Predict the structure.
Amino acid sequence: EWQGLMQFTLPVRLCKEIELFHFDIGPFENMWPGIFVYMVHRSCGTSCFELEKLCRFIMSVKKNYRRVPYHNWKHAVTVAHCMYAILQNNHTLFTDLERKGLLIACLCHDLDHRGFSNSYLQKFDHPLAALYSTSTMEQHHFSQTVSILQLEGHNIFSTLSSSEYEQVLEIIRKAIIATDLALYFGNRKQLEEMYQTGSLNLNNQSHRDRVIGLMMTACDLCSVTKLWPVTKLTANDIYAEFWAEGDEMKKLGIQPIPMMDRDKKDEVPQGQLGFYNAVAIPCYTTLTQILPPTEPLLKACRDNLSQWEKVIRGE
Amino acid sequence: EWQGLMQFTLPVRLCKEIELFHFDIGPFENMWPGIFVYMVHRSCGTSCFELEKLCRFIMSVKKNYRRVPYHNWKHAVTVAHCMYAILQNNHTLFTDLERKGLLIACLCHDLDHRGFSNSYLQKFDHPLAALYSTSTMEQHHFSQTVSILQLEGHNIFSTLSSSEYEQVLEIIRKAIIATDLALYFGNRKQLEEMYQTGSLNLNNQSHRDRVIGLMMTACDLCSVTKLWPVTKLTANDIYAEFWAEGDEMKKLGIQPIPMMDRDKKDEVPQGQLGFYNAVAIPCYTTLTQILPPTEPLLKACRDNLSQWEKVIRGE
Ligand SMILES: COc1cn(-c2ccc(-n3cccn3)cc2F)nc(-c2ccnn2-c2ccccc2)c1=O
Ligand SMILES: COc1cn(-c2ccc(-n3cccn3)cc2F)nc(-c2ccnn2-c2ccccc2)c1=O
Ligand SMILES: [Mg+2]
Ligand SMILES: [Mg+2]
Ligand SMILES: [Zn+2]
Ligand SMILES: [Zn+2]
């Protein structure tokens, strides 16, 4: 398969549309691997990786996403595309290494997800929770990334100096860890403070790591920034996973939280309203303040919030 | 009328156009019966049906389509033409009996449609729903097909062996039942799994039946695969039917669903995008995987999807 990927060319119509935040990859499944190649080439340059290695890496990444309702290969590519659009719109704020690192980190950020939350694994003493006591799945996702990199002919970072190889793995590690939404709340609070006091400094590495973290959250959640019908269908996939986790809990005699309880579908519109107000809107608001060209993400999120409000009022 | 049909010759300027998936029969109403004869002849051969019986059959089928906005004679011929194009592009795969059966099934697949959904007939205890509890209209369509065959001078299959006759009727029965969209979702999910696990085997009659079922769906929905002006205009006919059904419900003091509600007219473009993502795209995607020459249908579906997005966005 990776050999066919090498001759792929993005159709011209898509070349225009792919640059836009609202682009939905959904209708183009056969093209997703080629879309990632395209994005890496446009953002990082056509000789950034050896094509054969990049194509082998991409195909192995795809193979290592499971056929679960939401945390699947489609999700990986959707998140990578949102990152592409953020980077393209803020290109010179980030180094070559950061752009490479972040695109790869986005593609890999949910590798081998089994459709269960960190809370579930920790509460029910899964072996991954023994290995990774905090940010359990996210450490596993980074573990999986390194594991794929070290496969025969898969090492896309082979030409880097050791120093730069270390830097990029560290960029990738931090970015993947930051997708643990438990970490987002504190991150966003610190950044909002820094922005209000006028103290945010991108040349300050700790400030920089925080901005990158927020970008990762923004990308991870971007299904809430698509057109309404797309956002609604994605919500169905997200809840399919939540409910399947809740069902496992009920078998072990434990009441799930409302969002994981399929007997509480009525509260979904209000659940979505609550998530947009407490998580999504704040995320894209802070992002827009730090990186103004990302405003369309906030606008789109606001549009979908409005749609959920309509659902609540009776439509 | 059936006599004048026997003399019909398709205009040469249409001999290449008619082979294209995106061919629109729209401008050629007086030719529709002759177009069906032409397609039968090229696909099944001028030998397989006695011309007079075929011509009488076609004319009785036409008269048994009602004057409804969408499920009318034009839709019958449109669906038959898409099947013709699938069969012509995959000519090794299907037996003589299958090609015969499938063209006939498509022409007859909505016979005597009244413009009401199965859900409606079942909800309001229509006699047809008392008779056929599931796939209500589709069982009716098949029954109408058998009734027409059993008219004097109408049995186009009279020269088949007793065995061939019951086989072809079963092919038609299964093909018409498959056009109940309620059944498509499970059919396509099964096929996707079979393809993905490499267990799909066209020696297996149950597998053949599933593939034929998907082809039927693909042809039934093929208005979403025409050039944009044709697709857009057909969408009006479809909603005219949905809305008349919703209106019939209001008259009875009963609240129709969003799709049936003419007060949700402004939401049509969003509803189309939803339908394309949830139904049409997966349909033509799976079909293209199983039957690569059907690829132009998926390509045309994607093009119309982007047109609906542009409508939503106000482009
Ligand atoms: C109530 O509705 C929702 C709830 N959560 C949600 C998810 C996770 C956590 N969590 C707490 C601690 C760690 N993780 C909390 C949450 F609230 N996420 C989404 C959502 C919208 C788009 N991606 N995304 C998503 C993000 C991650 C996983 C699944 C879905 C959502 O729509
Ligand atoms: C919202 O837009 C649409 C919705 N449906 C639609 C239709 C049916 C069902 N159903 C019946 C039973 C279970 N489910 C669900 C549906 F969603 N069909 C079309 C469509 C596009 C092209 N043919 N075709 C069509 C197909 C069949 C009937 C009418 C129209 C459409 O455009
Ligand atoms: Mg994750
Ligand atoms: Mg029908
Ligand atoms: Zn994710
Ligand atoms: Zn039909």
